[PDB]
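Tutorial sheet, problem 5. The six components below are modelled jointly, 1500 residues in total.
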Amino acid sequence: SDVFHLGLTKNDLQGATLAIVPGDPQRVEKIAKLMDNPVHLASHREFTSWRAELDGKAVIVCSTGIGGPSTSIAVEELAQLGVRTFLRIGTTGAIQPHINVGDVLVTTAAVRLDGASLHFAPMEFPAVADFSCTTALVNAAKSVGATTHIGITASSDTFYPGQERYDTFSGRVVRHFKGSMEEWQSMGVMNYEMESATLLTMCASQGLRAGMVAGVIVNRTQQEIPNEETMKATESHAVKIVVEAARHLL
Amino acid sequence: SDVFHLGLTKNDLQGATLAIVPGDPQRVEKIAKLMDNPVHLASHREFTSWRAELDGKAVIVCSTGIGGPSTSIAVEELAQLGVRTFLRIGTTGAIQPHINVGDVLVTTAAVRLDGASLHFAPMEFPAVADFSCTTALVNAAKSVGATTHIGITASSDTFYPGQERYDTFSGRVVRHFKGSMEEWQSMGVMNYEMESATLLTMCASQGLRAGMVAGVIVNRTQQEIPNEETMKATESHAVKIVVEAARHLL
Amino acid sequence: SDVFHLGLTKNDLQGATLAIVPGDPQRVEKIAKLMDNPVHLASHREFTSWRAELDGKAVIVCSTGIGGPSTSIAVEELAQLGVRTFLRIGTTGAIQPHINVGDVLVTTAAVRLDGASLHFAPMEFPAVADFSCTTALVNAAKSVGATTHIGITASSDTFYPGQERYDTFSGRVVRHFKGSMEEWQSMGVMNYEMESATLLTMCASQGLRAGMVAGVIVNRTQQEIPNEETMKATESHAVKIVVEAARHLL
Amino acid sequence: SDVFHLGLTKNDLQGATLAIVPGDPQRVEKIAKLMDNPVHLASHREFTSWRAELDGKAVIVCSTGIGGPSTSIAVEELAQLGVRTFLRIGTTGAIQPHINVGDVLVTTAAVRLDGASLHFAPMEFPAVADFSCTTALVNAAKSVGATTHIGITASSDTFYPGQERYDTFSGRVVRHFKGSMEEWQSMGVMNYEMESATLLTMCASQGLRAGMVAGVIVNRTQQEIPNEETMKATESHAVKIVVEAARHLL
Amino acid sequence: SDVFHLGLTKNDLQGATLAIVPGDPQRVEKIAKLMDNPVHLASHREFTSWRAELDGKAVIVCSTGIGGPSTSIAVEELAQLGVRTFLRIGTTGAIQPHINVGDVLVTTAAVRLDGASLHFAPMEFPAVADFSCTTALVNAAKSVGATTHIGITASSDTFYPGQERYDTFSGRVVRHFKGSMEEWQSMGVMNYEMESATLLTMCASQGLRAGMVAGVIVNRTQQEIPNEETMKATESHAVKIVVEAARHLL
Amino acid sequence: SDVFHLGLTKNDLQGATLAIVPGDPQRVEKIAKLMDNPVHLASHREFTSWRAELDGKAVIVCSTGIGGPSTSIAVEELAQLGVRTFLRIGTTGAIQPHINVGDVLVTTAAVRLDGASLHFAPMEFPAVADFSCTTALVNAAKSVGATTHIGITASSDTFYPGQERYDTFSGRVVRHFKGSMEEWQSMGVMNYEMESATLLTMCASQGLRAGMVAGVIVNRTQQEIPNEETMKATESHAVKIVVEAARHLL
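Model answer (structure tokens):
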């Protein structure tokens, strides 16, 4: 296999420069159902990939799995495999009370709560999204009529403690990580996720544009229970936003 | 005076939710002059404000002085005085060979090396521009025909040792700052200035719209000293870009 | 599903206070097969669990994926699901010349370079194996005749830049990570893997028994590429060691 | 211009080795009204300077503007311009309740709350005042009969958050900076200011003596409202102390 | 003198590879009363040493005095003097309420609260005990029937503030060090001491095995007053454990 | 004994608000002998105190041992026992070529590289001498005709790796400490010792008067080994300076 994990060839990607980057393998095909001539390329470990075309040009939907490393490896290898533009799709909880379930997040830049981005840049270097990738997403979001928040999201190297989740075994979060929910909250930070800051940092540094969009399917800060359609209905909207935003990056 | 430093009051600002924030007192005046009904308001130390109109809307021009310390205050007191949108204008030089003299740079994000940025959010947190202002300033650079680069700018808390200048006659630069020139340069950063990472960070974590724009008066690797008929044109070029952008943010 | 990620419930685990935690979904199945009555339970993304018996006692095998982020979750949800004892099995390569191919490594402690370990305890705190599990795994390596080294393993939060790989096609590695290969090598560390410092640390500070074991598929300084009849034996060798150890921890 | 900012010549300073370093331009002339043959040298941005003579030798009063960078640049350039001894005059609030409005502070050393000093020394290196400069100030203070506190002052890279000022927009101070008022308070730290630690650090390192004195015109910790004469009356005392202390450094 | 402090010769140690390492000089002889042909070697400052034999081989009991530096120097010099295996004996308070006065602690690894270990390894490198040294102590502990806790202990560079002791002058502990008792407490950290992490780190790195055992003579967290026999009676048990554990390292 | 370590009570100190604090037990005795009515009080480990009179006023001499750990305790318990003024006396060597053998050094401030200083105040905070004690010790050095340098002394938490000694037979020194010899030397630091930054820092942040003084027994760059009739005179020289100073602090 030409790469390490992905196991893909320059024409196995069909020279595709742009990628769409969900974390989960069953969303890969999903996003790929929106674009023509799709093919599951490969699943090696969490590296399930598909390939379809957009406005006539070959594009790659590829799962990052969870976190900076499998996103790194993916992105690295995707970059090894010729990927210029990366677009991250997903769902999130809002840590900000002005924000609702069903809305759409466009992240301008991220908090580096990983160790993974610290690998591609000296930590002062911000985890930040390319302008043109961010512009597409906005332009794509408004056009399906989204409630669209543009802001910073927090990218954690751990689901629970880095996101200050007390519903785990410990009920404990390290001193360094305690109070950080409000710290990001009042700072205006829209949400939490694990992957971006790596993706953003490594794209920022390397001459590869990145951007990220998400539907808000839950609220870390809010009361009402969302209908079962929470994931599925909001995910359509944002998957469609990420594809259209992609169709405008070509 | 409703603030500790500037010397302004509220009726002074005359509405004016948007301020232009050049570094030096000297550049301040000229900026407002390009606008409508400029009036000198307050000159105190590094802090010099002017009031002027744009499409019937009051604008403030106010000097922020040298580096993040004096930067951080003016921003604070302008906002403290009711200004929600900040636009830094300036001139700089280009640590990336593709970036010319007479070049404009809009910054989405700043490398945070200045310690005055730290007083707001940790190095985990990105020093980020407001998407709406960045869009306004890019669409401005694009409206004036400017040759623009959009990316990261590095920010230091000292002209000399934080910008990695051994130009200082001590010629020292303590270890943490050593290597960053061709480091950031390989790493995508456009240029170096001491203010942005204090402001963008400050506005991002204060809930304010910030964006930045700069004329490149020198491309510093390339040994051509720019036209003896000077860098004064590239400042007069950038000062339109901020006024044009602002016009669209009103 | 009683946990956010895996897809497991309690009756699923069938008792089973002890889980085996390989990285990849693929190695998972085989492991449980060496045991009694294996049953595929849940395959979701990087998280794949199997249930199997040992001396009439239910064991879980569950994949943790790539690096500390995905690692940290599975561990969390397995424990969240009632598993107190964790045993990571894997294969690696040897940064110390005395360490061969076909070699086993039991880790007492991990160098914490991964940032996903940080979300639990500060770099002041050691990422430590459970003495009872380390004893079980050593007595196992000694029971299967394995040629073993016991010591520190280095852990990174990225395959490439945290493991000091300029193998990446960016080829970069920000300053904080530069030099560590022959650094750790002189400093006694056995090998490099991205998971242990997230788990051991996680279990040490969560009140859980953790230990780790690895087959060395490559000794990386010594330029001999290991037998073309492959590293598959050294994985089949180590997978006994974890099953043998576990047997003694029941 | 011979320097960068200051725009001064070796005899434009008249070879003056010693400087007096207020932050504000209108105090420059003030301090210069106490010494013979004064001349405003130059105001470029915040770099207003005067030159007079003391006991027969030419001396420089020069404004640092706000913060380490404009103090750096000044001091740097002053050092570039041949300045050995620096003496900082100013006013301050006490963060210590045993201290009164009207009293005089002599700072032995500073807390580095800037990023600016981190430019001239590796942070372990203390921000500390020369002994002989400090001795003059004491000796000068006692001789006008001052209530003279000798101690550490905190030097911040931001007026408000670094000094834990909640009376701003945010009402918020970063986690890292919260509780620090009392942290310095009970430690015995006399007061806050922005400039020194840079000045102290860069003088400590470079074979240039520094010292600092201040009148206390307000109390961050105390009740009673000071008369309008607070600034002016206390400023005389300390301006006179800084000149006399200077007259004893020759 | 052949070394620096210790002042010992290769046969003055009689080529002894193993050492026993109490902090206090009057425990040196004590531990040496359990092994044949003892001789006080030297007391230079806190470096009181004795030499006896164990199962026929010459061994060294040597005081480290207090802290990493005098332990370093000792250990360094002991290593300079040919010491491979180090075994630390002592007493401790439990910071964990599940633990009693009279019990025995075996430390697997330490928290680095010193600056001393940061000298022998880059802080990511854990302060960790050799397996075989730890195995002896367990095996030795059980055999006198000890109540034996195996776990992490916190190694501080200061008795009082690093251990969060409020019964001192200040009653104050630095922000960085406040709340750390519970931080280590709930993490499961068994106890506090000053010396180990240095000893552990420097042995971990250098091809020298280390381990540590202690009797619990007091509880930082508990009520009842222990009898006068607290030190003496519990110290016998653990001194005997450390000697027997030593007799099994040969 | 009113303190955990020393073995002293209050009537022991006989008043005596001022203690002299040499490192080693051996130098202790001689010091007090130069004073009036010396009496051996307590010898416990590194802690040895003596009581003696000066101009009818009781003084304490007490050993602090090796480095900041043992340092920090004695200081604590002496003060805990009622001593507000501390004077460290010692001998060292000179990292600056202008500094001789037979030279005295009074320290205003210490570079904080020792981690035992950190337990009091952050690296933001300077490790500062008490002006009144520094004055007393300078006026003392000047009273005995001593050739003195006044400036910064570097302080490490280990004799070898924190003082950048590869003299150690491991010969290692982890990256953070590498380069500091000619670093501090260019940067103005006078010498290197492991205690001051623990004490000065400790007294500064505890509200105590601290100052330090040292004889230079070796100028270490200059390859002249000092007089074979030894460094014993330069210690006998410095021991007057502390006793003379103290005399003026009573």
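Marking note: The domain at 1-250 of chain D is CATH 3.40.50.1580 (Rossmann fold). Full credit if you identified this.
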